[PDB]
Amino acid sequence: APDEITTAWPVNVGPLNPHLYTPNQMFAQSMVYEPLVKYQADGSVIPWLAKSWTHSEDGKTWTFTLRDDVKFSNGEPFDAEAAAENFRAVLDNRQRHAWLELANQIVDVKALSKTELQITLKSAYYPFLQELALPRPFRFIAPSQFKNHETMNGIKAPIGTGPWILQESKLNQYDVFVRNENYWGEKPAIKKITFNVIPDPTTRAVAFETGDIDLLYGNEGLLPLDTFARFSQNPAYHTQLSQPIETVMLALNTAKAPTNELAVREALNYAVNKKSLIDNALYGTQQVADTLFAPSVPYANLGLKPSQYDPQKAKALLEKAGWTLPAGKDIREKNGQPLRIELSFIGTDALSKSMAEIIQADMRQIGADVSLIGEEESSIYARQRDGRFGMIFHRTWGAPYDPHAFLSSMRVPSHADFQAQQGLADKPLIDKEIGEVLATHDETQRQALYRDILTRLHDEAVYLPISYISMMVVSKPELGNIPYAPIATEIPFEQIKP
Ligand SMILES: O=C(O)CC[C@H](CC(=O)O)C(=O)O
Ligand SMILES: [Cl-]
Ligand SMILES: [Cl-]
Numbered sequence: 476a477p478d479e480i481t482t483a484w485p486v487n488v489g490p491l492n493p494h495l496y497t498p499n500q501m502f503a504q505s506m507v508y509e510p511l512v513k514y515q516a517d518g519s520v521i522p523w524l525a526k527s528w529t530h531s532e533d534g535k536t537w538t539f540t541l542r543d544d545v546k547f548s549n550g551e552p553f554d555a556e557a558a559a560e561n562f563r564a565v566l567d568n569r570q571r572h573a574w575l576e577l578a579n580q581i582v583d584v585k586a587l588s589k590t591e592l593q594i595t596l597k598s599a600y601y602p603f604l605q606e607l608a609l610p611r612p613f614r615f616i617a618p619s620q621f622k623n624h625e626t627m628n629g630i631k632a633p634i635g636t637g638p639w640i641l642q643e644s645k646l647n648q649y650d651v652f653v654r655n656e657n658y659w660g661e662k663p664a665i666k667k668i669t670f671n672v673i674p675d676p677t678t679r680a681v682a683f684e685t686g687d688i689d690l691l692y693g694n695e696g697l698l699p700l701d702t703f704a705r706f707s708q709n710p711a712y713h714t715q716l717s718q719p720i721e722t723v724m725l726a727l728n729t730a731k732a733p734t735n736e737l738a739v740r741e742a743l744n745y746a747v748n749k750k751s752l753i754d755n756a757l758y759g760t761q762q763v764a765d766t767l768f769a770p771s772v773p774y775a776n777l778g779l780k781p782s783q784y785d786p787q788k789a790k791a792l793l794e795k796a797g798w799t800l801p802a803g804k805d806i807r808e809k810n811g812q813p814l815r816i817e818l819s820f821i822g823t824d825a826l827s828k829s830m831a832e833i834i835q836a837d838m839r840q841i842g843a844d845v846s847l848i849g850e851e852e853s854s855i856y857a858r859q860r861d862g863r864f865g866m867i868f869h870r871t872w873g874a875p876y877d878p879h880a881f882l883s884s885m886r887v888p889s890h891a892d893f894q895a896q897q898g899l900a901d902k903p904l905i906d907k908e909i910g911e912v913l914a915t916h917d918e919t920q921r922q923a924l925y926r927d928i929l930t931r932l933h934d935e936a937v938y939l940p941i942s943y944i945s946m947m948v949v950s951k952p953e954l955g956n957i958p959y960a961p962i963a964t965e966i967p968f969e970q971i972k973p
């Protein structure tokens with residue numbers, strides 16, 4: 476059976492609603508649904524579904540000449556009226572998409588002719604095309620697939636215009652995709668991809684060793700990192716470690732004792748041995764992170780001061796702040812309350828857990844008591860919505876979300892970043908400046924707003940940056956080189972020659 480391939484993913488791909496989030500998996504959404512405009516490594520975009528466009532001088536009104544020759548999939552036509560209906564379906568759920576500033580900006584969309592689409596924006600919005608390129612939400616499902624006249628409540632069947640079709644899905648066993656034969660673009664060489672649902676990292680490694688899995692592709696969690704390092708030595712396998720794509724950190728709750736105290740957040744930044752953490756937990760496969768964004772991220776080379784590992788500084792900071800060691804205890808007290816801090820994390824991820832124990836042990840040495848609460852993933856998202864954490868693992872999103880989309884999302888009253896930042900006197904200022912970062916057309920202005928925002932987040936110790944992580948590949952040598960997509964969350968199955 477060339478030309479079919481088998482892979483793994485630790486969960487099912489999900490309902491494949493193009494317009495919702497969890498549990499839809501983004502690489503899958505991107506396999507089935509396509510955008511107006513496709514993101515490129517240079518940061519630019521190229522015509523995709525939209526063959527061309529023009530804009531008013533004031534730059535608020537955009538007219539896209541769609542391609543004429545595109546059909547979902549189930550045969551139905553792709554035309555301006557379908558696009559308009561998707562946008563409308565998206566904007567009915569607007570408050571959910573408020574993390575993405577484009578959502579806050581679309582004033583209306585109007586189908587001109589069969590081939591002309593009119594989007595109008597509240598401002599001349601410079602991140603427009605790149606944000607339209609995103610896996611989600613501005614991608615197109617056959618309107619004939621709504622429920623009522625909505626997508627926010629569910630869809631019927633995942634019909635899009637992409638090169639791949641969801642054939643079959645069996646919770647929690649496997650998802651099958653077949654190549655779309657009536658596809659407007661280039662023919663993918665692979666005709667079928669099967670995702671075996673396999674939640675555990677070691678089992679994923681054993682499954683690759685059996686010969687049944689053609690390709691594994693994913694982040695640091697893909698498989699255990701010591702086995703990956705063995706696999707890389709094996710002349711009968713192929714492996715790849717990309718350059719770093721995003722950052723992994725703790726977020727510290729500034730609106731919740733004791734992490735509401737600057738001194739405490741700084742003493743925590745000082746108390747962790749990051750290199751020891753990375754060589755141990757992460758097997759020296761990844762690199763040490765000092766700042767929310769690596770210096771290689773646009774706008775982010777700022778020379779921000781690293782917090783290097785320093786338990787005496789940490790415990791001096793704590794001391795000066797009134798957190799003191801009472802006769803007979805390990806753990807500091809202020810007005811009789813112990814320096815206790817809750818760290819929350821997906822109870823079943825092996826990496827988070829290992830990291831958590833290390834962090835726990837490192838703080839304990841400075842008189843801070845962290846208790847590990849491992850819990851259900853849905854419970855973790857909830858506390859992130861809620862504001863119900865001391866410290867929480869968290870990560871950035873990869874190009875092209877970093878920094879601009881990731882900063883935008885910090886403003887939206889729920890998720891992790893707004894909640895962790897709620898207790899800063901500085902917060903309304905930072906939210907106004909993020910806003911200005913997305914508004915301004917002058918690069919010199921942009922350079923300084925980014926410096927001011929990232930500098931404040933950094934000096935206020937909102938985060939404990941941990942590492943900069945990479946994509947990871949394990950594959951059969953016959954597939955050749957496996958490429959990386961310009962969007963970090965996509966997998967470019969269509970480029971593989973088996
Ligand atoms: O890129 C990411 O990890 C997240 C970006 C956005 C965030 C959300 O769930 O509100 C999404 O998930 O598309
Ligand atoms: Cl509205
Ligand atoms: Cl998030």
Ligand code: NI
């Ligand atoms: Ni997300």
